[PDB]
RNA sequence: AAUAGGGCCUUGUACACACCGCCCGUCAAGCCAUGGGAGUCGGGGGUACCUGAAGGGCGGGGCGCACUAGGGUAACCGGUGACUGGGGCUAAGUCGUAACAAGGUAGCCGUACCGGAAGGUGCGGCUGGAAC
RNA sequence: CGGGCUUGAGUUCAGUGGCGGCAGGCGGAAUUCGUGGUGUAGCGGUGAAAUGCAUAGAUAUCACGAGGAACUCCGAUGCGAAGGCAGCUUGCCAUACUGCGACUGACACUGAAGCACGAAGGCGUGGGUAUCAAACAGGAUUAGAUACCCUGGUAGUCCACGCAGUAAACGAUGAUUACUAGGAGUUUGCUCAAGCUUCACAGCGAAAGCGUUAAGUAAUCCACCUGGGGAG
RNA sequence: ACUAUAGCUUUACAUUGUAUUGGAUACUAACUCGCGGGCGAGGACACUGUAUGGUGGGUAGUUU
RNA sequence: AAACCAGGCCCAGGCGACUGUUUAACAAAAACACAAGGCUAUGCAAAAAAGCAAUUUGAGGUAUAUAGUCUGACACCUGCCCGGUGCUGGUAAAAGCCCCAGUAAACGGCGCUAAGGUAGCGAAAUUCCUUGUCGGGUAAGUUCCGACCUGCACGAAUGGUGUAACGAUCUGGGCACUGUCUC
RNA sequence: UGGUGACGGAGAAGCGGGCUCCCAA
RNA sequence: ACCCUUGGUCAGGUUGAAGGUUAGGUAACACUAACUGGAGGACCGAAUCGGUAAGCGUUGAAAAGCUUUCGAAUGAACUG
């Protein structure tokens, strides 16, 4: 759900934000949060390697459980919670042993539900199973790439993948980008799609909101001088020629995947 | 609605003289009100059941006609039945 | 010596000096009525404000009420205007042939897109259509 | 105005339905693309051709993988206020017809304003995108072809929510009630009653024709017309 | 503009081995990655060194 | 309103939606940014950026994400061209190159070619001739506003045409007011 | 081994601070 | 100049979004009325940040200032 702001201000006329309807708690679990220090896009030499990063609201880091190791121990959903670090919401789980954890909240998960992990776990929403136990055709997220490493694949708000066929020790999965690829049957995934699918409908409305989110203004290359950018220069407006970066990397069709990568043997169809 | 024979018999027993009073006012009113409530609860979930919506409007008209007949007959029964069921809104 | 078009029926018609028929639209010509516009010029009434005669009222003065006169904003009723677009009738000069026969791609209704022009095409509907 | 009656109207019960509405699942044929076997001089299209695909390897043919749309035979009849509704199944709704020896007692009809629904095409946001296909591009025929024919092809066609409110939205025939002749079929409930369509008395009509589903005989209310253009 | 050149990229040799009907397949033991404090996934490829062919105003020295 | 203190107002245009930023010390703007839109890359030791490397940023984020590039709220829209240039494909002891196919919200073009400028604008921040011509305003108008279209040399995301609100922006006209001026 | 430490912004209220709300958390 | 960590500051007045309550209205929503509420790169304006226009200064009080005027002033704010 989203909320549109009435046009009492020019900076509010085009603002659309979320309704925060699924959030049930206002403060985070203390044992699972730590203060976060911001980079301005600078690496360990102090030189800025990534542009347009800096400022924004102070944030705390929530430790998200992407491994789901406690197999067979049931957990109960305590609260649905806001996370400043990612687009999706998180869910606080209490285990029967007194452990507490955070997971990425799937769509349709409510307070009071029970989740499990492992081969014995039922293929319902919020359960984390090896892909060899997931019946063909269901909607999954938080997909592992190597057994035991942790979820890497389907994590953003609203995104989902589908398990379409299994071929021996591998399964065929269609990815959010449209790629079709093989994943080992030992890898884990969580049933359901990621919640908060209305994230893409939000509109900032003003430059200040990007400043709050921690982004700095971006300058086009055509309005620089030739000493700063290949596309710069000229008197009056000029098109800049073929679009390219500061180092001259073409920006309108040149592929940059390494064309000898071993992971190509596990890709069936390509869409990126 | 559920509209069971037991529910209809209980409604008739509560409203009107004896169970056999199936076709009298203050009992047709109660049956129509029950059906209207159940149809509203059904249309809350099925927002495209336009046939059910039209049937609900017909039931509302039928209850209005029975209430007008009660108006023509007297006013005490009118006041009693509307105070009991809950009508004016 | 060598070699193997016309009548009688059923149909449709916007034709009837009768298909060598009748009609549709565009552009160019001439008359008439009515539209739209930077602006410009008036008339009648209205709300407020400022002054305000005579005659009475209240208190020789003072203060009231309103007949007008004055400014200004708002209506309605009207004229005119660089320029720019429909319609009718008379001519018919030009360009094609859309409809009337299965009118030569059946026709019409709605809708959308596209063309000098009548129109063409897509989707759904109708017979006020053949022909099977 | 004050009472009564049950025949009209409505409620209940039983039986009989149904391409009626909404929602969730399941399907095979055809067809599209990608990746691999076989194989090579054409395929496709037309009145005849050409534009197009194809030896840096087509059509055809055998597989595997990823998808979208439509529901052959039954199938002409039935349902819905209308628009409309057709693969299989389930759930939730609505509704109709017939009867009861059950009930209430005229509670009825119509309806200017208003409200609701309302084919196709069209608009907005998000998905999806196989076929067909406006616009557009090329090839033909013609004096020309801004068309008809052929090859491509984007919106659209599909889904969800929201606008829009139009049609040859037609039976070119408003709703209700009562009555009035026969033939040919058909469906359901059982010789009878509902419904479904064409010949046809009286009657009506200018005629074509309508004729128990009237355009016949009558009563109640609503909508609309008053010569053709201009002009919806 | 002339000449170079970082980077990217192609092949050969080295790292680098074994079998079967050569250039394909297969194997695991070199080599790489993940998990836990051996197991799993790859695999003679990838990576890197030497040589070689392309590309290279990204950078440099110059000429005009 | 008693001193001090304490909005001038209206009509009509160009540009840029807006609040913001900028040449410390001659330029505050129509320049930059911006919310938003498109295209392209990237399946995660991601692409990309620093570094000889180790390592770090990206990001401990995972395609509703990140990065490169152009356009720049919103409304109605965004026409034809793949010929050219880019881009994507099918020698030492094979890449390329050729050829063919695709790509214009890629650079670019829209007078016999690849295609001959669609809608919308137009003496314009674009018009040389030029103070173009007609109308409005003034006693008198090289500026301004409205039309006309031989557009030297507009034109649709180096976006076209509009647009309420906003501006120490540029530009024209009125009322008020005055030593700006007659002086 | 578990709690405190330990945390935002705006605004009621107390000559004669709790608290409420909000999202940028 | 930009970034990182950790602190601080912003007189007074105005306007009146979301939301809430109570009335009518609905089959239920919808939808009107009043009060409440206090949002905002909102408005006026001190401190403060900045530097529009004019005047003065130009061996200046000053190697960039002063006076008047003017912009922003809860934020993409200023500052240790
Ligand atoms: K920019
Ligand atoms: K350069
Ligand atoms: K013709
Ligand atoms: K024809
Ligand atoms: K119809
Ligand atoms: K007949
Ligand atoms: K001008
Ligand atoms: K612009
Ligand atoms: K274009
Ligand atoms: K200071
Ligand atoms: Mg510059
Ligand atoms: Mg220039
Ligand atoms: Mg002519
Ligand atoms: Mg140089
Ligand atoms: Mg030298
Ligand atoms: Mg500006
Ligand atoms: Mg400003
Ligand atoms: Mg300066
Ligand atoms: Mg300055
Ligand atoms: Mg720009
Ligand atoms: Mg002047
Ligand atoms: Mg402000
Ligand atoms: Mg100040
Ligand atoms: Mg201020
Ligand atoms: Na040029
Ligand atoms: Na003045």
Curated annotation (Swiss-Prot), chain A:
GO CC, any one term: large ribosomal subunit
SMART domains according to UniProt: Ribosomal_L2, Ribosomal_L2_C
Region of interest (Disordered), residue spans: 196-272
GO BP annotations listed: cytoplasmic translation
GO terms assigned for molecular function: rRNA binding; structural constituent of ribosome; transferase activity
Keyword annotations of the record: Ribonucleoprotein, Ribosomal protein, RNA-binding, rRNA-binding
Keyword field contains RNA-binding: yes
Skewed-composition ranges (Basic residues): 206-219, 243-272
Pfam families attached to this UniProt entry: Ribosomal_L2 (PF00181), Ribosomal_L2_C (PF03947)
SUPFAM superfamilies: Nucleic acid-binding proteins (SSF50249), Translation proteins SH3-like domain (SSF50104)
Alphabetized HAMAP family for the sequence: Ribosomal_uL2_B
Matches recorded under PANTHER family: LARGE RIBOSOMAL SUBUNIT PROTEIN UL2M, RIBOSOMAL PROTEIN L2
Record's subunit section: Part of the 50S ribosomal subunit. Forms a bridge to the 30S subunit in the 70S ribosome.
Homology family: Belongs to the universal ribosomal protein uL2 family.
Function noted in UniProt: One of the primary rRNA binding proteins. Required for association of the 30S and 50S subunits to form the 70S ribosome, for tRNA binding and peptide bond formation. It has been suggested to have peptidyltransferase activity; this is somewhat controversial. Makes several contacts with the 16S rRNA in the 70S ribosome.
UniProt xrefs under NCBIfam families: rplB_bact
Name assigned to this protein: Large ribosomal subunit protein uL2
Organism: Porphyromonas gingivalis (strain ATCC 33277 / DSM 20709 / CIP 103683 / JCM 12257 / NCTC 11834 / 2561)
UniProtKB/Swiss-Prot annotation, chain B:
CDD domains according to UniProt: Ribosomal_S15p_S13e (cd00353)
GO molecular-function terms, A-Z: rRNA binding; structural constituent of ribosome
Protein name: Small ribosomal subunit protein uS15
Cysteine-cysteine disulfides: none
PANTHER family membership: RIBOSOMAL PROTEIN S15, BACTERIAL AND ORGANELLAR, SMALL RIBOSOMAL SUBUNIT PROTEIN US15M
One Pfam short name: Ribosomal_S15
Subunit description: Part of the 30S ribosomal subunit. Forms a bridge to the 50S subunit in the 70S ribosome, contacting the 23S rRNA.
InterPro entries: Ribosomal_uS15 (IPR000589), Ribosomal_uS15_bac-type (IPR005290), uS15_NS1_RNA-bd_sf (IPR009068)
GO biological process: translation
Organism superkingdom: Bacteria
Cross-referenced SUPFAM superfamilies: S15/NS1 RNA-binding domain (SSF47060)
Organism per entry: Porphyromonas gingivalis (strain ATCC 33277 / DSM 20709 / CIP 103683 / JCM 12257 / NCTC 11834 / 2561)
Entry keyword set: Ribonucleoprotein, Ribosomal protein, RNA-binding, rRNA-binding
PROSITE patterns recorded: RIBOSOMAL_S15
Function: One of the primary rRNA binding proteins, it binds directly to 16S rRNA where it helps nucleate assembly of the platform of the 30S subunit by binding and bridging several RNA helices of the 16S rRNA.
Gene Ontology CC: cytosolic small ribosomal subunit
Family per record: Belongs to the universal ribosomal protein uS15 family.
